[PDB]
Design a protein around this ligand. Structure first.
Ligand SMILES: Cc1ccccc1C
Ligand SMILES: [Cl-]
Ligand SMILES: [Cl-]
Length: 162
């Protein structure tokens, strides 16, 4: 198991523009296109992303290309964040994957409200952090995914993903 396989399980793969859990136009492997409610805006962002007139449809390869950029960008965002980096640096490899999954799903900004969990993770208080992470809109809206990521932080293993 790894970050790529892990997110591939959490996000799925769709080759045609779809609405995500929040109702936002997405494609591929969790690649958000836009928060605007306009399909057209979405198709424009798509064409800009792919570098071609897609007509709302992409190939598996193109999907994988977006995915690779998105993972990388995620990691890099964490490493450039002063609030984040130090926690991330404190973690083992499996838990780092859990950190990346959250940033990928919610952005650096969505993870901004997790201050108290972050501090718990840094101190390696696993069961405690696991309980604090669950008190969130994230957990309530996407409970199955949230539990997998939480178990991961809690255990430092890929059990939730097997
Ligand atoms: C989002 C994030 C980033 C770095 C460490 C842990 C967490 C939850
Ligand atoms: Cl892009
Ligand atoms: Cl879910």
């Amino acid at each position: 198991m790894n970050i790529f396989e892990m997110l591939r399980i959490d996000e799925g793969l769709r080759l045609k523009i779809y609405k995500d859990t929040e109702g936002y136009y997405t494609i591929g492997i969790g690649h958000l296109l836009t928060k605007s409610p306009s399909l057209n805006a979405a198709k424009s962002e798509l064409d800009k992303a792919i570098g071609r007139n897609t007509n709302g449809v992409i190939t598996k390869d193109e999907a994988e290309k977006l995915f690779n950029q998105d993972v990388d960008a995620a990691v890099r965002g964490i490493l450039r964040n002063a609030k984040l980096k130090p926690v991330y640096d404190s973690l083992d490899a499996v838990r780092r994957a859990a950190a990346i999954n959250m940033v990928f799903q919610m952005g650096e900004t969505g993870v901004a409200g997790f201050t108290n969990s972050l501090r718990m993770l840094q101190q390696k208080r696993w069961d405690e952090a696991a309980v604090n992470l669950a008190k969130s809109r994230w957990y309530n809206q996407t409970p199955n995914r949230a539990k997998r990521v939480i178990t991961t932080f809690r255990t430092g293993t890929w059990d939730a993903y097997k």
